[PDB]
Ligand SMILES: COc1ccc(S(=O)(=O)N(CC(C)C)C[C@@H](O)[C@H](Cc2ccccc2)NC(=O)O[C@H]2CO[C@H]3OC[C@H](OC)[C@H]32)cc1
Ligand SMILES: [Cl-]
């Protein structure tokens with residue numbers, strides 16, 4: 070699909086059998102979700118944003134479906150005001166910005 | 169231009185006669201710059217990010233050049249770890265996400 074930016078570029082995701090919405094976020098290196106359970110081991114990581122720092126759980130090689138497209142990548146679980154899909158996963162979709 | 173997202177989508181901006189770089193950020197409703205002087209009146213505003221909140225100055229009808237394209241819009245000045253171009257200005261470029 071092609072998306073204009075008059076509205077937030079929100080897509081449906083499926084992860085660990087859970088359905089959620091997330092923002093396609095070219096400003097995010099990494100993918101960060103709040104409202105989700107993932108199984109298995111994970112590494113503490115700190116990530117910064119406008120308001121400072123957030124402590125997140127790093128989960129590696131997570132299967133995720135983003136607007137129908139199946140990928141495997143790193144997912145961070147932690148407090149975020151919005152679920153965000155970062156460039157780590159958008160590169161798997163072959164996503165481009167056009168102007 | 170069309171760009172891919174293997175690297176951060178950073179563009180050159182010119183604002184109030186100052187040259188800077190900024191991230192094209194589909195996850196940002198608003199444009200937030202740290203390292204710049206704008207003249208005239210402005211309004212307190214609080215904006216929420218990953219890590220919480222930053223206090224910013226809202227400047228309206230600011231002339232800005234983004235990768236060669238002249239626009240006028242709202243610019244927030246405040247602490248941000250990265251200068252960001254939000255959808256308020258990317259819609260003025262006719263920017264789209266494609267996958
Ligand atoms: C290395 O890994 C990451 C590091 C940082 C981030 S981030 O979320 O902090 N961020 C980085 C930017 C600030 C350099 C990505 C942004 O797209 C972020 C994504 C985002 C979206 C919503 C809430 C919080 C964060 N957006 C905003 O903070 O937007 C601000 C500014 O405009 C307003 O619109 C939305 C917010 O208002 C709600 C305001 C993500 C992954
Ligand atoms: Cl739109």
Ligand SMILES: [Cl-]
Pocket residue numbers: 141142143144157158
């Ligand atoms: Cl990844």
